[PDB]
Amino acid sequence: TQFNITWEEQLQALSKLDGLHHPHKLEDISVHWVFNPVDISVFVTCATMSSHNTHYTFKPQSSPDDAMVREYVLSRIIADNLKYVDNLYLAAGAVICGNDEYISDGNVVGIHIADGNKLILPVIEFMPGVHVDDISDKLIKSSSYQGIFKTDNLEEFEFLVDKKNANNVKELILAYTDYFANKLAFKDPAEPAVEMYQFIDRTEVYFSFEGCHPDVEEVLFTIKIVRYNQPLNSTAMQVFLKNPLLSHIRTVV
């Protein structure tokens, strides 16, 4: 470890978040980092005893040191535990429990399509520590075009996730929007970013948020919602979902 982040340091940072009482398991983190002069980026590896090593890459705005990397890793841990804030956790739980076909990882909500282990089409992905502006270039390149998305409108969410889930999903976005605006407020209020991209086969909507936390420069969080072009309600979807091959798709590590 170039340096260590104790679990107590993490818990003290997480304790400044409103409504957080059941964070993820926190262990001492051994942090390694290397600076790359060619592309001006820092590669960070975090190792704990229980979980497997996570890695990050960020672009430094001044010469890298341990203090900057420590602050960056904290911002990722803070963002990672927003999902466990009471009202945010409850808002996601209402989405998942409101649909027997929805099953959750913890970071991905997907439509259950087959049993293996389970097979899913992702529709909601939680992306802590990510903002859409940092990936918009590849999104513009790989998508057909960018569309518009009305932020607070129930009919938009009926389109995205159907009437069965529209209000729950809309409340999930609103819960994150309110939490960042009221509980992670900057002196100069940050506005949420909403960006919609159309692909050959799907619509993707990104909801990105910037939050103020005492111990870091910025807390980033993005929620991605996917709508596949064929309506999940009927037609080709029923032909596709009943094909028995799906229950024999194998995952090779």
Add this chain to the structure above:
Amino acid sequence: TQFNITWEEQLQALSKLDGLHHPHKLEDISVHWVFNPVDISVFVTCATMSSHNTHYTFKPQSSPDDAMVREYVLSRIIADNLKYVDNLYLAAGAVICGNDEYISDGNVVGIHIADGVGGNKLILPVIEFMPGVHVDDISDKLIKSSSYQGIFKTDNLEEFEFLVDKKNANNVKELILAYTDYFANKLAFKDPAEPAVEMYQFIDRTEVYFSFEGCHPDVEEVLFTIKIVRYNQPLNSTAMQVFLKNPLLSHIRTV
């Protein structure tokens, strides 16, 4: 601890295999094991520096000890490296290169589905290599979960045309033959072991298991099974062929 298997012991055992020249990377193994008296089984854990951990479960035929577990783990390593025997590796390559839709990943030859997460590949299996496994040890589970059993004849190419259609039938038949000849001629017992062929019919697929038992100087037995799956409709069929190109498949993920 509880005992180690150095890479030299592994390489010495592997060097007795005819036609093996490019084995898998070999490292020292740290082996842990524990006996379970309720179901009379031994659970084994094997750890290396580069690609740990592997796990096994077997049923001991006498009171377990290190020497038995060491022999068992060696038999799994030997079976694992049969895939790299020249004529067996070549016979597998002929199946793989004989179909642009066939891809190989790990012990599975099949149809690519999705690229998943962090190096994972979602694949529809067609041929599965199963080193260290014999069908007689899973047949009870297979009989209960299947509709019925059939009789499969390895002499007949048309039955391989049923399994993997005509584009792959002869390459696949030669793959089975290569393993059949290798075990009979290169891993022979004094009392010859006959290969096991068992076909199982499910509602949605047919699975044919080709199992083999091999004699090796350092272990009681070498086991190897090849599983071939035919699904409800053949691969080159039209109504299927449009299914593997549905764009949804690339977005599939596993929990």
